[PDB]
Amino acid sequence: SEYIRVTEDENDEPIEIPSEDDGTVLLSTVTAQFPGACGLRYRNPVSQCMRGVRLVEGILHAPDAGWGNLVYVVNYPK
């Protein structure tokens, strides 16, 4: 039952987004909860700077360090 936590505000309580069997997350799993979302970002706990999730053909790839216990934030266009 592996998942990642996604919110549109670190203020708000996040939603649990299930991962696939290969450990990736489908953009479609995110957009079902956050229609219009064009990607994920998180605070790098080392740099304390915001950091992007790799996205290739509707597939979100875990950071090299793994998904971990991080809260991910959705990006929308304007």
Numbering used by the authors: 2 to 79
Mind quoting what the paper says about this structure?
Mislocalization, cleavage, and aggregation of the human protein TDP-43 is found in many neurodegenerative diseases. TDP-43 protein has several functions, and its modular structure facilitates this multitasking. Two centrally located RNA recognition motifs (RRM) strongly bind UG-rich RNA (Lukavsky et al., 2013) or TG-rich DNA (Austin et al., 2014) directing TDP-43 to pre-mRNAs and intronic sites (Tollervey et al., 2011). At the N terminus, a ubiquitin or dix-like domain (Mompeán et al., 2016, Qin et al., 2014) provides a polymerization surface that enables formation of dimer and higher-order oligomers predominantly found in the cell nucleus (Afroz et al., 2017).
A fragment of TDP-43 comprising residues 1-270 including NTD and RRMs was used in crystallization experiments and the structure of the NTD (residues 1-80) was elucidated at 2.55 Å resolution. The protein appears to have been auto-cleaved at N terminal to RRM2 during the 7 days required for crystallization to produce diffraction-quality crystals, whereas RRM1 is conformationally mobile in crystallo and therefore not visible. The TDP-43 NTD crystallized in space group P212121 with five identical molecules in the asymmetric unit. The NTD adopts a similar conformation as reported in a recent crystallographic structure obtained in P63 space group (Afroz et al., 2017). The head-to-tail interfaces between the molecules differ from those reported previously (Afroz et al., 2017). A sulfate ion binds at the interface between the molecules and is bonded to Arg52 and Arg55, which serves as a wedge, increasing the distance between the monomers. This binding of a sulfate ion to Arg52 and Arg55 rearranges their side chains preventing strong bonding between Arg52-Glu3 and Arg55-Glu21 reported in an earlier NTD structure (Afroz et al., 2017). The changes in the position of the monomers against each other alter the superhelical bundle arrangement observed previously (Afroz et al., 2017). Each spiral, with radius of 46 Å, has 10 NTD molecules in a full turn with distance between two rings being ~36 Å. Analysis of the structural changes on sulfate binding confirms that ligand binding at the molecular interface could change the nature of the helical arrangements. These head-to-tail interactions that lead to parallel spirals are consistent with the view that physiological TDP-43 oligomerization is mediated by its NTD and may be key to prevent the formation of pathologic aggregates.
